[PDB]
Design a protein around this nucleic acid. Structure first.
Ligand SMILES: [Mg+2]
Ligand SMILES: [Mg+2]
Ligand SMILES: [Mg+2]
Ligand SMILES: [Mg+2]
Ligand SMILES: [Mg+2]
Ligand SMILES: [Mg+2]
Ligand SMILES: [Mg+2]
Ligand SMILES: [Mg+2]
Ligand SMILES: [Mg+2]
Ligand SMILES: [Mg+2]
Ligand SMILES: [Mg+2]
Ligand SMILES: [Mg+2]
Ligand SMILES: [Mg+2]
Ligand SMILES: [Mg+2]
Ligand SMILES: [Mg+2]
Ligand SMILES: [Mg+2]
Ligand SMILES: [Mg+2]
Ligand SMILES: [Mg+2]
Ligand SMILES: [Mg+2]
Ligand SMILES: [Mg+2]
Ligand SMILES: [Mg+2]
Ligand SMILES: [Mg+2]
Ligand SMILES: [Mg+2]
Ligand SMILES: [Mg+2]
Ligand SMILES: [Mg+2]
Ligand SMILES: [Mg+2]
Ligand SMILES: [Mg+2]
Ligand SMILES: [Mg+2]
Ligand SMILES: [Mg+2]
Ligand SMILES: [Mg+2]
Ligand SMILES: [Mg+2]
Ligand SMILES: [Mg+2]
Ligand SMILES: [Mg+2]
Ligand SMILES: [Mg+2]
Ligand SMILES: [Mg+2]
Ligand SMILES: [Mg+2]
Ligand SMILES: [Mg+2]
Ligand SMILES: [Mg+2]
Ligand SMILES: [Mg+2]
Ligand SMILES: [Mg+2]
Ligand SMILES: [Mg+2]
Ligand SMILES: [Mg+2]
Ligand SMILES: [Mg+2]
Ligand SMILES: [Mg+2]
Ligand SMILES: [Mg+2]
Ligand SMILES: [Mg+2]
Ligand SMILES: [Mg+2]
Ligand SMILES: [Mg+2]
Ligand SMILES: [Mg+2]
Ligand SMILES: [Mg+2]
Ligand SMILES: [Mg+2]
Ligand SMILES: [Mg+2]
Ligand SMILES: [Mg+2]
Ligand SMILES: [Mg+2]
Ligand SMILES: [Mg+2]
Ligand SMILES: [Mg+2]
Ligand SMILES: [Mg+2]
Ligand SMILES: [Mg+2]
Ligand SMILES: [Mg+2]
Ligand SMILES: [Mg+2]
Ligand SMILES: [Mg+2]
Ligand SMILES: [Zn+2]
Lengths: 248, 91
RNA sequence: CCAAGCGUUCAUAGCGACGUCGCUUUUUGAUCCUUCGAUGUCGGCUCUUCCUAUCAUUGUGAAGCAGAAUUCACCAAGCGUUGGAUUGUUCACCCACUAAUAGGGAACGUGAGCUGGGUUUAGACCGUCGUGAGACAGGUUAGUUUUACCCUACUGAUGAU
RNA sequence: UUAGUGACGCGCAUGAAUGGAUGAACGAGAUUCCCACUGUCCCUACCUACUAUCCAGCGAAACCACAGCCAAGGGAACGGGCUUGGCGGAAUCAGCGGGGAAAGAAGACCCUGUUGAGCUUGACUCUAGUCUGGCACGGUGAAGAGACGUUUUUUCACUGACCCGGUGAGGCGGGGGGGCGAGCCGGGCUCUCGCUUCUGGCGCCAAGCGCCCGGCCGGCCGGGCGCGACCCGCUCCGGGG
RNA sequence: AGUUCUCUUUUCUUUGUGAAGGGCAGGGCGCCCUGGAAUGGGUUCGCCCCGAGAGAGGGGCCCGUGCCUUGGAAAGCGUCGCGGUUCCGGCGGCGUCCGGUGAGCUCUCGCUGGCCCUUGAAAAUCCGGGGGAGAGGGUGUAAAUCUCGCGCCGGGCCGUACCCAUAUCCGCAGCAGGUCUCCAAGGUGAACAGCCUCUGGCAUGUUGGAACAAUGUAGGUAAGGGAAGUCGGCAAGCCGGAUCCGUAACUUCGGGAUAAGGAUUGGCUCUAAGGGCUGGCAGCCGACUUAGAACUGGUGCGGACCAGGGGAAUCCGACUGUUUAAUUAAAACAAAGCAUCGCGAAGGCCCGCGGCGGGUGUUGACGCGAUGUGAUUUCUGCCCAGUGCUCUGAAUGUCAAA
RNA sequence: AACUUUGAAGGCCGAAGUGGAGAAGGGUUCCAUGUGAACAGCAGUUGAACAUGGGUCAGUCGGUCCUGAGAGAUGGGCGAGCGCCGUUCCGAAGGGACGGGCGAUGGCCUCCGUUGCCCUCAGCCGAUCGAAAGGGAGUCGGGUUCAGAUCCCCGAAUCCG
RNA sequence: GGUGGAGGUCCGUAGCGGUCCUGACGUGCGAAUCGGUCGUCCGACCUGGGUAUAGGGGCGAAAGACUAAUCGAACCAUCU
């Protein structure tokens, strides 16, 4: 048989991200003396739409503490920020929506967004629209914090990790039926070459394990083992169970 | 004169997409096109620019908000949660 | 063909058991001789001709032929043997008229005559089967029909000894 | 009315996201009936244009063993040829599709071949990848459990190999110096901090103080240095290891 | 200039002003100043605007492709008349004038709105601003300096013909195929439709003549019947525009719908209504419409052209979209919706012979990756034995190298 | 001489043209004259054929420059190797400057220049390529040829340096 | 009762496609064209050039389709 679509996606080619009109990568500030020991002030200049992203982006301007310059940063917009607002980042910023604090100083139950997976990486967790992570508990002796991620997993992270107080803007986006193939066509024309999707049973055996047959049937169990070779790992990959999720 | 009995603004979709889906999208369609009163100037001009971005034509202010409503219930609750935690943080 | 019986009586008007002798190749088989450097594979439409194992009509013989109607048989294929609903149908069945609505051959007549409904490529659906790819004298839907100006034949047209 | 529709259902072999039942709108999708319409037909006719047709000019190709009238016979079981009969008369024109088992393409069907190829799998033999153990890179210190000062192993650590993140590698570690609090009898210390949160302003290229040097005539003009901006340090800072 | 038998103060043609500069119309302003508004007012086709300052006054600015002016009448054109070498940028005369009108078409400038789970390039290049390091001269023959007005010098290299398509390109060819664009007249008409015409162009598409048999190909018409033909109404045919009326089942209340079904339609002569400008009135200008009435023709009138047959049901697929270029356009694919599955980055899925390699990823669970079903509505029963997937493990059979 | 040319008729394309111009492609087919052998599926006095000679003129119209999707060196990595990967990633990646201090040279030797050294200041952080439709200053009117003109001539402007 | 003018909305031209006649043609105008009749025609729309993906590879709204008249594995040379 031939190489299946899933295999072909990893080569780039026609399967690379549509980044022509994206405004840039969204990050917190690179940590420096101001955020390690005090705080720094910025101003929300504009809140902008980033193609292929549900959440809006905020353009926050700071002063460079060592040079006569203005630094333009592209933040993930916390819901409720507005242009002309002042946001603050550092070890000693106040607990307000949009401020950037180390999770170690945040009290228990703080709702945060654009959280750092590892200290100094400028934000990796809870960046999608509407999402947020929560602070469960601190362990000051081991200098660590326990956060609850949108997926519901509980992670132990360094206390020095920074984050944005509040939830990500643009929430509730998935509550609108798309109603139309064309509206989904436009959704992914800004993201990547992943639409529309052709069913495996709808193909021939040459290009898919589920393909072929005088009836459109899978024919073989669709739960495939974790270590199946590429080109065979299709269907439900390493499924712990299947069927309707009745009960908790 | 009342031109439709129940479709309202989703009457643009005609017979397509199913009654229940058309009923569902109607609530969002009304809300994402409403002009909300601006908190910063008070003129009813706040309007959706993109998904999540709300702009006021009077005072020119822009606000990051919900996808289809100016502020989501989840965000409103969190603002009161953050306000409350702040006080205990400094008593 | 024989004739036990049926036919109230009466074997043979008309039938005919148990047996037995043939014919035919419009049934299906059996075989594998010709054709696989291809003879276009069903049915219908059209058109001509031929057979008789005669339905009608002509001329007749016999009846359990009074008449009328019918049945059996002879010479007999000259002339006829139709319009329709359902089905791709051959076949079948029914409606209606009719003198009668007989049965067949011609490469199971006839696709460089047509048509392409079915069968029988590639797309696709259902059921049964198969782990599967896929299979099914099981259903369903969509699916390219080429060439004549040559020879003969035939139809007409000049014409030849 | 082997068609359609509605019912029936022990359904060869219907059936629930291998989705079941439905249903408005939609369909160059499949089917049945009805109105209207009509040459589809009964049953064909006439008319027009371009051909075919004849002429001047110009002019191919397919195909072809030899050829080219029949009946029967026998025959590779359906003859143009052969046998026996019927018979046969130049050269040609327009048509025609009976025949030449006409042309077209080494039959796609079917079988055979120790010929394949696409695809599948519970075929045979392998294979990338992947999971797993050992050896090496591969270190330092503690304990616990073993064995005879050495060595096997478990846990907890360390960092320096190795890896990750960030930065224009910009203030890291320790100490000094200063501030608010506490409390032992003005001083010591538990021990904390490092000057920015009201406003959609501005913010660099030193002020000031101290010390020396130069040029011209104590006055003018111009330099340098130190503090301002604490000292010392061995990995830039973090995260793993 | 054409027609002039008759008529036609008639029909046709033609009746300029560039770039740059100045001036002025006109358009636009989310620009300023006075002032303080509810009996709220202003205002558009729609909107929309106002104590965060409306109405009303008075101003400032941007574009002015519009008109005038310098250009510039000298040129060009129309026309009549003379010249010459006569192949002269030949010379003269006159003219190149005045108004109106429009949902008209084409382009453009601007204001205001709607759509997005779509937000719709970058860089070269040029400009303004903040700052005040510096510089310039000591009352002058003033200096530094100047994005002001004139003046001076130069702008090298390469392309440029023509065709651009029923004959200059690709299909073996002057091949009915294919091949990216700009401009765009009058009539009818809703119309860039079809039909006729002007400007411009062409010579019937690689030949002609004479006939008018059959059979064709493409068009037509048929008495009476009306699908009896055929597998099947294939083919053809009926309908068709517009105005007025009328319109069912079912329905997801949006539709169905031009449902279905009727009536009307010419020409001609009138009537009524619908506006602007100026100074409940008067005068002058007007642009096409709608409606009604009489008269009228052999009942013809959407007279050509253009231009839906309809209804009752069953199956399938919700729809729109896509597909086997060259036999299958479909019930197949997609789809929104629905439901499962993996993954918190030393990750999930995938690429790559190879790496401090690569894609998703300028990403972070409302995400990415892997499947199935296939809108809405109602529902989705039982089975974990089989085969798969998955989870626990020294408690513990087998188990390689070391 | 049916077919060439001029004149007159009758027709057609009917401003989504059979009209006037371009891009890609062609490459002399363009223009003048001559021939009528071959070619232009009849002919031809004709032609996009053949033969002999001509014709494309720019600061202002494009290219030239920018960067886009992307392509692609060096550093580094890999690689038996031709090489591949990679594009800021494991890099001592600036050859510049206002100004100040020193010398050496010059000339309108007055004083200004130049040149060499030193002090001082410097993110850009990715070489290079990538569009005759994107961005990109500035040329228009009249005349003129067999064939060229916003290019030649007459006139009137303008940008850049 | 007006105004307004939404729509993967309807009729319909350009454009794009290609249902039926199983019409033409079938040594064709044409190694896929022609005519009438048809689908769609504001969007999942049509299209030029630039660039990217290359053979067990690509690309596929999925027909084993397309990948230079070649595709159930292109073409060229060699092995031969
Ligand atoms: Mg398939
Ligand atoms: Mg397979
Ligand atoms: Mg008896
Ligand atoms: Mg045999
Ligand atoms: Mg043979
Ligand atoms: Mg034959
Ligand atoms: Mg044959
Ligand atoms: Mg007889
Ligand atoms: Mg036969
Ligand atoms: Mg025959
Ligand atoms: Mg045939
Ligand atoms: Mg058939
Ligand atoms: Mg088939
Ligand atoms: Mg019937
Ligand atoms: Mg039934
Ligand atoms: Mg179930
Ligand atoms: Mg089933
Ligand atoms: Mg002749
Ligand atoms: Mg023979
Ligand atoms: Mg024959
Ligand atoms: Mg053979
Ligand atoms: Mg063969
Ligand atoms: Mg053998
Ligand atoms: Mg094999
Ligand atoms: Mg092979
Ligand atoms: Mg096995
Ligand atoms: Mg005002
Ligand atoms: Mg004059
Ligand atoms: Mg200034
Ligand atoms: Mg030219
Ligand atoms: Mg003609
Ligand atoms: Mg001619
Ligand atoms: Mg021609
Ligand atoms: Mg011709
Ligand atoms: Mg008739
Ligand atoms: Mg009649
Ligand atoms: Mg019938
Ligand atoms: Mg019949
Ligand atoms: Mg029809
Ligand atoms: Mg209806
Ligand atoms: Mg459909
Ligand atoms: Mg096809
Ligand atoms: Mg499933
Ligand atoms: Mg199980
Ligand atoms: Mg021309
Ligand atoms: Mg042209
Ligand atoms: Mg000739
Ligand atoms: Mg010429
Ligand atoms: Mg010049
Ligand atoms: Mg360049
Ligand atoms: Mg490279
Ligand atoms: Mg350019
Ligand atoms: Mg539409
Ligand atoms: Mg439509
Ligand atoms: Mg087709
Ligand atoms: Mg045909
Ligand atoms: Mg023919
Ligand atoms: Mg697309
Ligand atoms: Mg590959
Ligand atoms: Mg596709
Ligand atoms: Mg198949
Ligand atoms: Zn406001």
């Amino acid at each position: 048989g031939r190489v299946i679509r899933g295999q072909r996606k990893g080569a780039g080619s026609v399967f690379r991200a549509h980044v022509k009109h994206r405004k840039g990568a969204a990050r917190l500030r690179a940590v420096d003396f101001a955020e390690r020991h005090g705080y720094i002030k910025g101003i929300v200049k504009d809140i902008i739409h980033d193609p292929g992203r549900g959440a809006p982006l905020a353009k926050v301007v700071f002063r460079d503490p060592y040079r006569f310059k203005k630094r333009t940063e592209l933040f993930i917009a916390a819901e409720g920020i507005h242009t002309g607002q002042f946001v603050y980042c550092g070890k000693k910023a106040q607990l307000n929506i949009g401020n950037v604090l180390p999770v170690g100083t945040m009290p228990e139950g703080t709702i945060v967004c654009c959280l750092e997976e590892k200290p100094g990486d400028r934000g990796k967790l809870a960046r999608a629209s509407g999402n947020y992570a929560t602070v469960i508990s601190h362990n000051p002796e081991t200098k660590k914090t326990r956060v609850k991620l949108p997926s519901g997993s509980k992670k132990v992270i360094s206390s020095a990790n920074r984050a944005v107080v509040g939830v990500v803007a643009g929430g509730g986006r998935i509550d609108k039926p798309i109603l139309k193939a064309g509206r989904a066509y436009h959704k992914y024309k800004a993201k990547r070459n992943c639409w529309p999707r052709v069913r495996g049973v709808a193909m021939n055996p040459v290009e898919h394990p589920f393909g072929g047959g005088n009836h459109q049937h899978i024919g073989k169990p669709s739960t495939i083992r974790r270590d199946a070779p590429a080109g065979r790992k299709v269907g439900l990959i390493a499924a712990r169970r299947t069927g309707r999720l009745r009960g908790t | 004169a009342k031109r439709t009995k129940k479709v309202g603004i989703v009457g643009k979709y005609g017979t397509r997409y199913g009654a229940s889906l058309r009923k569902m999208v109607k609530k969002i369609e009304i809300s994402q096109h409403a002009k909300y009163t601006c908190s910063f100037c008070g003129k009813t001009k706040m309007k959706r620019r993109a998904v999540g971005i709300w702009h006021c034509g009077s005072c020119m202010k822009t606000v990051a908000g919900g996808a289809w409503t100016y502020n989501t219930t989840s965000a409103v609750t969190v603002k009161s949660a953050i306000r409350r935690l702040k006080e205990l943080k400094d008593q």
